[PDB]
């Protein structure tokens, strides 16, 4: 006997759960097929709660599914072991295609550039403009040319705090659960309590404007107009020691990123430089930009950079090869981020571009196909943006923060 109906045979053995485990591996399309094989298969899928289980597996893997679970509030039907109110299998079976529909209309919104736009006037004092920002579900924190940090309610767009202390423009910031960290034209880095807004530390070191910083896992890196990168052990907000100074660039170091392996610096001197995170020794230079580099992000093997030459470049950090040049911005590329699906760039002409990342990395793909959308709502240079599966938030010389919503569209 060369054939056995596993999904029937196991229940007949009293071993329903095993049959369920088998089906639990299937993707939606295959699971649908399995339902149609015969009544006993349908019965096992239905009573084994396989669609609830699948949706949970999508949420546990895909942050998009995670996101939607929260924003749509069908997360409240997931996990929680026992039924309780007991939404039946039929419900979760009905929901899966509605999530897929949801998802496709989101992608369509990005592609066709349908969005809800909300505009925060940061009502800056004399000096106008918003050089940096970071957000979460609850708030947007921003750094301004008037030397202030402003915190915005994410929902109401009200201003909740205004931190003052820097004697120059706030050029870069990053925050976590515990602190905000900022670099200013005044050459200081300041650590603030993310809640009380109390100054916890001030790093005196850079001789000139501090242009970028990043911290993670008890390590902080700063970089300055003084052409230096500083690497800090960051035990706590108050226990922050200078580990090494990397001097390397012939001009201002405008941006710095890193992970476990590599620190990545980019400069007005037209170079990206790679350094060992562990040894702080130089590794390799990534040259090719025809002009200064204003912005960069590093993740995995991929460095993406935006230049005064009006191009974006994609690099492999291991051989330092440029994989793709992206042309279309008519001015300097002043900020840039990416995830797995796309690149979002901002330029000095106040325009924001959205690029197919996977297409950019396919060397067969024409330039023709690479820019999905051009978003024109700023009336000044774009200094900073952050985005996720659902939105862009951008800040600008025009003294505005823009929320572009591709989920809650009208």
């Amino acid at each position: 006997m060369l054939q056995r109906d596993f999904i029937t045979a196991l229940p007949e053995q009293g071993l329903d759960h095993i049959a369920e485990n088998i089906l639990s591996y299937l993707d939606a399309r295959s699971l649908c097929a399995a339902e149609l094989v015969c009544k006993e298969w349908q019965r096992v899928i239905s009573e084994g709660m396989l669609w609830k289980k699948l949706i949970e597996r999508m949420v546990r893997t895909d942050p998009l599914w995670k996101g939607l679970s929260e924003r749509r509030g069908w997360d409240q039907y997931l996990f929680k072991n026992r039924p309780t109110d007991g939404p039946p299998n039929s419900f979760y079976r009905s929901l899966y295609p509605k999530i897929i529909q949801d998802i496709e209309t989101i992608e369509s919104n990005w592609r066709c550039g349908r969005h809800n736009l909300q505009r925060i006037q940061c009502r800056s004092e004399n000096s106008k403009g918003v050089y940096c920002l970071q957000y979460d579900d609850e708030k947007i924190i921003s750094g301004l040319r008037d030397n202030s940090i402003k915190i915005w309610d994410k929902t109401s767009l009200e201003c909740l705090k205004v931190l003052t202390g820097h004697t120059g423009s706030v050029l870069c910031l990053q925050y976590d659960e515990r602190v905000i960290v900022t670099g200013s034209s005044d050459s200081t880095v300041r650590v603030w309590d993310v809640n009380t807004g109390e100054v916890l530390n001030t790093l005196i070191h850079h001789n000139e404007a501090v242009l970028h910083l990043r911290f993670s896992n008890g390590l902080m890196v700063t970089c300055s107009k003084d052409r230096s990168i500083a690497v800090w052990d960051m035990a706590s907000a108050t226990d922050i020691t200078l580990r090494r100074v990397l001097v390397g660039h012939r001009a201002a170091v405008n941006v710095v990123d890193f992970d476990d392996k590599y620190i990545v610096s980019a400069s007005g001197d037209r170079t990206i430089k790679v350094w060992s995170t562990s040894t702080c020794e130089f590794v390799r230079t990534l040259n090719g930009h025809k002009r200064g580099i204003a912005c960069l992000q590093y993740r995995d093997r991929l460095v993406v950079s935006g230049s005064s030459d009006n191009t974006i470049r994609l690099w492999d950090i291991e051989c330092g090869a440029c994989l793709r040049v992206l042309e279309g911005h008519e001015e300097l590329v002043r900020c840039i981020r990416f995830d797995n699906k796309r690149i979002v760039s901002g330029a000095y002409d106040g325009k924001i571009k959205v690029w197919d990342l996977q297409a950019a990395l396919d060397p067969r793909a024409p330039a023709s196909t690479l820019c999905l959308r051009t978003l024109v709502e700023h009336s000044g240079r774009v200094f900073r943006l952050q985005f996720d599966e659902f939105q862009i938030i951008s800040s600008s010389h025009d003294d505005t923060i823009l929320i572009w919503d591709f989920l809650n569209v009208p």
């Binding site: 423009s169 034209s185 242009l211 012939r250 201002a252 400069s267 007005g268 200064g292 240079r381």
Partner: peptide
């Protein structure tokens, strides 16, 4: 204007 970046030209 733009204190956030510098070139070298």
């Amino acid at each position: 204007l733009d204190s956030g970046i510098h070139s070298g030209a």
